Every structure is written in structure tokens, then in C-alpha cells.
Amino acid sequence: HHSGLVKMSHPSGDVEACMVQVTCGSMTLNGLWLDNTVWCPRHVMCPADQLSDPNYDALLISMTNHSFSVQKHIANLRVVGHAMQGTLLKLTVDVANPSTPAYTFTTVKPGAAFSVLACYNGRPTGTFTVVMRPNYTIKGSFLCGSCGSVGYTKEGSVINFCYMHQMELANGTHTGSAFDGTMYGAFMDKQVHQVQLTDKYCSVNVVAWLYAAILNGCAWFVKPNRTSVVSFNEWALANQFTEFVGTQSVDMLAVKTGVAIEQLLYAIQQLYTGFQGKQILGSTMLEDEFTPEDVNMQIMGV
Amino acid sequence: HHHSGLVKMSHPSGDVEACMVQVTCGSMTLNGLWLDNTVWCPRHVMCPADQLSDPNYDALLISMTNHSFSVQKHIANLRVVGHAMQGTLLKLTVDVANPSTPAYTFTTVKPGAAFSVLACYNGRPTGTFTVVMRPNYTIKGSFLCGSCGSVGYTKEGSVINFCYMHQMELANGTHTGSAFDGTMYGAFMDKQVHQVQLTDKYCSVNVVAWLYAAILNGCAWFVKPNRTSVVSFNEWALANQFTEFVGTQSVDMLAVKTGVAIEQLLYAIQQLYTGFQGKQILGSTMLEDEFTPEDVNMQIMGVV
């Protein structure tokens, strides 16, 4: 009955050690302390007065190092330099973080899972995992004061920082910056209504989920009928799906269950219409929030 | 806010990551929890796979010395200087106090309560997730060979409350484990035999919490003036696979905020149980009982 799939996050300790509070005038949000740098969203510079069409150039010029105050709650640090990269501030502080993990910066693509460490006032408060949606939003849990919370993946013991929280959209979803300063989805870090694109289903994750179903023996939807890749991709452009792209991870799944991608691409075309009275893993709808990697690791332990 | 703002949220695991160690005895190897000068681990680490059903724990313990247990940290070796059994756990004494022990308590959790799990293998933490202790005293986890001794916990202020140490998987794929007083949740036995769990039920108080989250999101089509009292609901619950509803201060805060009374939602549950008749609540077509009142207060209302 129970598949052994849960929404699984990375242990957050390495990232907890890097969170600080950043304060500038009257805004206070979270920042990420790596080596001698503190990253935080540039809208810390902006009075609540004027959070639409903020003039970030003039705000920055307006600033000095004494403007910014960095506290470490979970020491206090002196800012001695400040620059702006896209929608992020790069603050230079006098002490290096002694607990900086090995890390890289990366940009996540639609379909990919990452962990988030939600923080308020520099204090870590919860962790959860999201999938970057095809419209470059995430379905998170963020309240006033959460900006600067960060999202990351792990390769080995290396942390790959991929997200810093910036805002909530009209429909309740969220977006943020990559650490190159760019906002996922081209969204503006200005407090104005903005058009979210239509969401789509993450095909490879649906495929990974059906493989999960088969590994748990629930395989009724498996018919010998097969559908090609480039055709399925034809069908998906009109039916709110994304391109399918195999990966070694998907391939491992095909091989332990001896059910080929293409049987499942066929199954999805049938299942998009309805489960037709049946359940798959206790759901009546397709599930696109589990990756091939999630399923390999949780069910088979790679 | 077509997105609810509700996700499966765990506590930050850093505090607990620094207490995980690997414990080995003969060739069975699993995880333990290092707090000050004590290391807690499941007692079936003492057991050889051959003898893993019908094992003689009182005797295995006798056959051990302090050198029989090797304890190692990765996230050094530790010297065990005493050993003892406490229900289904071992309490080992080591000669170094964990320099990163958090403030902690040992509190057994009740059905409906949520806790965070730090899944670990060979003493290395690999993932974290949250679960609800089900009414049949199982949890719906993700655990594989090697995960035993993985721990579940809550946080209250500075204080971690350790509430679970993982022991086993059941026939239906769910899991159970010990509280740190040594008892097993659900009376299950640390023997490798097929054991059948009792029937599961809906956690009434959590379904209420979740219907308050719906109202807070503007989804209130299911709210009517009609009401069912807690007594009447609890009578109906016994017959319809629901737990007894017990109110708390956390539920009450949701009722104050929304203006919708607990008893209106108990009535709604009686109606919604038989089907949503084509509607959805927060994108679901069935009742959701995995979110607690505390969950909803914190995630939607920023309340602790």
C-alpha cells in the first residue's frame, strides 16, 4: 500500500551555519554568509514606502557600508564593501565564515528538485523540497520576512546553491534569484502584478513516478503498446506537457523494471485522459513532483 | 493563492545531524544518537542475522563487553565504557561528551502528531522528511536497509524533543520504531516476524486544521451554518474510522482567525467523508489529515 516515496530534503546543517540576518535602514531579511561574502536580496535597500518601480541604481549609490548591519544569530560582522549583481547584493564582511561548506553555484532547470531552508530574521525555521515549475515558479511556503532563504542541491558533500527567495506571485507560488543575480522566469524584483505563464506537467518526472509505481508492483497501466519520443513530444506541445528527455537515471529505472520509457509515454497519453476507475499509488491524477533520481535513491538506494 | 502555501515542512536538521554516529557489533551495523556521554541505538544491533527471529536479548546483552560495541563519528572513534539495555534500545556510555549536544527532552508522541525524521546510513545523514504518527502507531516513511537508528524529533524553542528511533518496516510498507524510553510504538516487537498493524483511521483534528487552511485560502464552499458537537462527532467517529477529536489552543487560534467554529467543521467532515461531489478543497478530492493545527498556524499565519 505504501510506496516508500516521501518528499525528501537534504540535511540542512551545512547551510544553517551560513545564514545571517541582514538589515539596512528598516528592512530586515536573511543572507547567506560564504567565506567573506554575504549574499542577500537587493530589495533590502528599499523602504516599504516605495516597493514598486524602486530605483535600485539610486538606492545603491545612496548606500554606504555603515548602511548594512549583519548579525549571526544561529557574532556580529562589519561590512567593508558592497556591490549589486542582478537582483542580489554582494556584501563583503571582515570575518570569513569558518563553517563555509564546499560549494558551487548552479541554476536549476524545470523538473529538478531542490531543498529549501526557510529562515526568518536569520534563524532557520523549516526545510522542504520543491520542483522548479515549467513556468519558473515554485510551490513553496514563504511568509513576510523569508526573503534571503536559500535553496540548494548536493553533489557528494558539495552544496550547489541554486536559489534565493525574493517574492510571492499572484497565484500563491514563489520565485527567487539564482546566485548569478538573475531571477528565475525573468520576474522583476518589484512589487507589481506579473503574469505567471501556464504551468505544464514535467514528463520525465511523471515517467519516474510510473516507474516507482511498477517497482511497487502497481503495473496495471502497463500495456505492450509503445509510443515514440519525438511523437510524444509532438503531442505534449498541445497538451500542457514538457518535452521528454531520457537520462541515465531514467534508464536505470527502465532496466530494473524491464518496462521501456515508451510503454510509459503511451501510458501517459492514456492516463492524461483518466485513470478510468483505477488508482496508481493511491492517486487518481498523474504526479510530477518526484524525479528519476528521487525514485532511484528512495526505493533502490543509489 | 490557488497554491495553498502548505508544504511538507521538517525542522532544520543541523542540531541532530551533529549527534549521529555509526554503531557496529559483530557484523550488524546501524546508526546511533550521541547525546553528552550516552549513545542510543536499537538493540537488534547485537543480533546475528541467523538468530534474528526469536533472539535472546537478555542473553546477548550478557555475552557483551564494552569492546563489543564500536562507535564512530564521521559528520573519530569513541570508547564505550558502559553498556545497558532499556526496552528495545541500548544505552551505551562513551568517554567523550558530544561537544554539540542540543538541549533535549525525550517525549513520546501521540497519534496525529507530526515529527521530523533524519534518515541516516552508516552514521551519515542522507535526507530529512516529516511524518504523522498514524493511529495504528505506524509512520509512512522512506527507509532502506541500514536506516535503523535514524531518529525522529520535534523542536520547541531551543529544545529538541527526541521521539522516535527507527526499528523496522511492516508488510504494508509502513514503519515503526521506539520512543527513547525504550518502548516500541504500537507494541510491535523487535523480532523479524510478519506482524500485522491495526486498522488505520483519519486523524480528525488534522482534517479540521486542513479545512481551516482552506478557509484561510478563500476556499470555504463547504462551510455551512450547521454544526455537530464534539461529543456527537466522537460517537460518529468510532463508527466511521475517525479518531476522537480533541481540541487544543492551536485549533482555537484558527477558529478565532477565521470566525468559523470547530463544530461547523466537524459537521462538514461528516458530509465530506462520503465524497466531495465534484468539488476540490485545496486541489484535493479527499480529506487530508497529514497537516496539524500547528502546521497550519505556522505556515499560513506565522504563529508559534
Curated annotation (Swiss-Prot), chain B:
The signal peptide, as residue positions, is: none
Query: Which reaction is the catalytic activity of this chain?
Result: TSAVLQ-|-SGFRK-NH2 and SGVTFQ-|-GKFKK the two peptides corresponding to the two self-cleavage sites of the SARS 3C-like proteinase are the two most reactive peptide substrates. The enzyme exhibits a strong preference for substrates containing Gln at P1 position and Leu at P2 position
Q: Where is the active site?
A: 44, 148
Q: Where does the Peptidase C30 domain lie?
A: 4-304
Q: Which residues form a coiled coil?
A: none
Instruction: Report the protein's function.
Output: Cleaves the C-terminus of replicase polyprotein at 11 sites. Recognizes substrates containing the core sequence [ILMVF]-Q-|-[SGACN]. Also able to bind an ADP-ribose-1''-phosphate (ADRP).
According to UniProt, the name of this protein is 3C-like proteinase nsp5
